[PDB]
Structure 1
Amino acid sequence: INARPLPAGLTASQQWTLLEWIHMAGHIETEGELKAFLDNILSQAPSDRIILVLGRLNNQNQIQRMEKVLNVSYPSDWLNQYSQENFAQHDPIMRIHLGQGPVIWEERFSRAKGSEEKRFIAEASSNGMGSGITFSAASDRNNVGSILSIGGKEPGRNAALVAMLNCLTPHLHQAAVRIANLPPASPSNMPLSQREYDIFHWMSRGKTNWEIATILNISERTVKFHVANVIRKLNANNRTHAIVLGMHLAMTPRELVN
């Protein structure tokens, strides 16, 4: 399993708080809960400005297109300008390879050479957005990742909080994915027709295609067709794999009565 390592320096009190944070994050299912949770654990200073952005990524894990903007406390004026002036294309923070460690904005701003990037930096600055830090995480089996940005003074000064937030970020990302209602990581199974299910029923009992043909009184030609469709609908590699992957269907062919 690919996961950033837990932070080593932490006091027992910090280790507990982080466990609470990650455990709670894993229960977040609504945008409201996520907004409230981000707001809470980043409450002081009340002058900080927070946003989480979920995006579709290229093969370098950089955001290609945003999937969801979850504002916590970015100024609406700034978001308006960011949208209208297409700052996503000029914002050095948007070029980050998601899943690396925290990025203090000046690390990037101090190195920006391009005209559009310099303009963005000046505009950000005049909007009170000149300094900050960004945490990020990316999924392994779906091209999506989130950035968590905190704008404000003295970004990253609290080293332990940075480590804890960095560790928490992947969990905030997964929560963002849940609340964003995206298509599944890989295609869902497709519902079998009754005839495909009847065929799968006998597959699951160890019947050969010919035996199934006999039982259903159709040619094996037809059985083979249905079997191919069952395998496809279950995203299986073969007949035998489909029987394993489709076990849930064979176990509860109808609504369980309670």
Structure 2
Amino acid sequence: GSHMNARPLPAGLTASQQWTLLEWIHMAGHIETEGELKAFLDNILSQAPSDRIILVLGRLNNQNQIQRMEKVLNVSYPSDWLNQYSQENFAQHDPIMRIHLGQGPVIWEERFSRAKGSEEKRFIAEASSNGMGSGITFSAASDRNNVGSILSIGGKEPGRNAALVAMLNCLTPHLHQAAVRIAN
């Protein structure tokens, strides 16, 4: 069952990290509103003016890719970047929108380097000029409804912190269930 197939918890966390992860997952399971989700992510993840954090709940295709955004839960992507992303249909050129939700974390660099299209390259240049040339995306999908969420965090630093990556990866299914409560 889905409870048994829950992604495995991290091995080798410090006592401090284990306690933090327990706090995070316990708290996430109480989030009922957009306001609470944003405050929670601000509280546990926000670090600096240069932060780039967003959570997106989407309707999925047969490869667990987001076909339609159901709910966008912004924390620190620039307001006008989202406008531009909508206005210029970036979802069609953004390599991160092609991820198969429910796989492990995806470092942007690995997808950005494999760009072939001039237009994909243009999007990546534009993203870079907005502080989003590097980053990491965590994901989770429900088993019994075709919805899933991605948690994106900009910058090189998060992906190089092994403990944080493992912790955020385990938190992500809980953020997804929160997003589903918020969207309902």
TM-score by length of 1: 0.67
Task: Check the 8 A contact 2:149/2:176 in 1, yes or no.
Answer: yes
Q: Distance in 2 between matches of 1:91 and 1:16?
A: 36
More strand per residue: 1 or 2? 2
CA distance in 2, matches of 1:43, 1:58: 31
For the 8 Å contact 1:131–1:155, the answer to whether it is kept is no
Q: Which whole-Å deviations, capped at 9, do the CAs of 1:146-193 have from their partners, x for residues lacking one?
A: 0000112434121111110110000000000000xxxxxxxxxxxxxx
1:32 aligns with 2:35: yes
Find the aligned partners of 1:173 and 1:39 in 2 and give their Cα distance.
Answer: 16
Aligned CA-pair RMSD: 3.4
Measured against aligned partners, the alpha-carbon deviations of 1:193-235 in whole angstroms (never above 9, x if no partner) come to xxxxxxxxxxxxxxxxxxxxxxxxxxxxxxxxxxxxxxxxxxx
Give the number of aligned pairs: 181
Paired position in structure 1 for 2:74: 71
* Contact 1:137 1:170 (C-alpha < 8 Å) held by counterparts: yes
CA distance in 2 between counterparts of 1:27 and 1:140 reads 21
Q: Are the counterparts in 1 of residues 140 and 149 from structure 2 also a CA contact under 8 Å? A: yes
Q: Deviations over 1:98-131 (max 9, x none)?
A: 0111111111000111222111111111122111
Match of 1:20 in 2: 23
Quote the offset at 1:56 in angstroms.
Answer: 0.2
Identity of aligned residues (%): 99
Where does the alignment leave 5 or more consecutive residues of structure 1 unmatched? 180-256
Cα distance per residue 1:229-252 (max 9 Å; x no partner): xxxxxxxxxxxxxxxxxxxxxxxx
TM-superposed deviation, 1:59: 1.3
In 2, the alpha carbon distance for the partners of 1:2 and 1:32 equals 30
Query: Is the partner of 2:46 in helix, strand or coil?
Result: coil
Q: Which structure ranks higher in relative contact order (CA pairs < 8 Å, sequence separation ≥ 6)?
A: 2
Q: How far did residue 46 of structure 1 move?
A: 4.0
Which of the two has higher C-alpha Rg?
Answer: 1
Q: Give the Cα–Cα distance (whole angstroms) in 2 for the partners of residues 94 and 64 of structure 1.
A: 9
How does the TM-score come out when normalised to structure 2?
0.94
Distance 1:155 1:167 in 2: 15
Q: Is the Cα–Cα contact under 8 Å of residues 52 and 131 in structure 2 kept in the other structure?
A: no
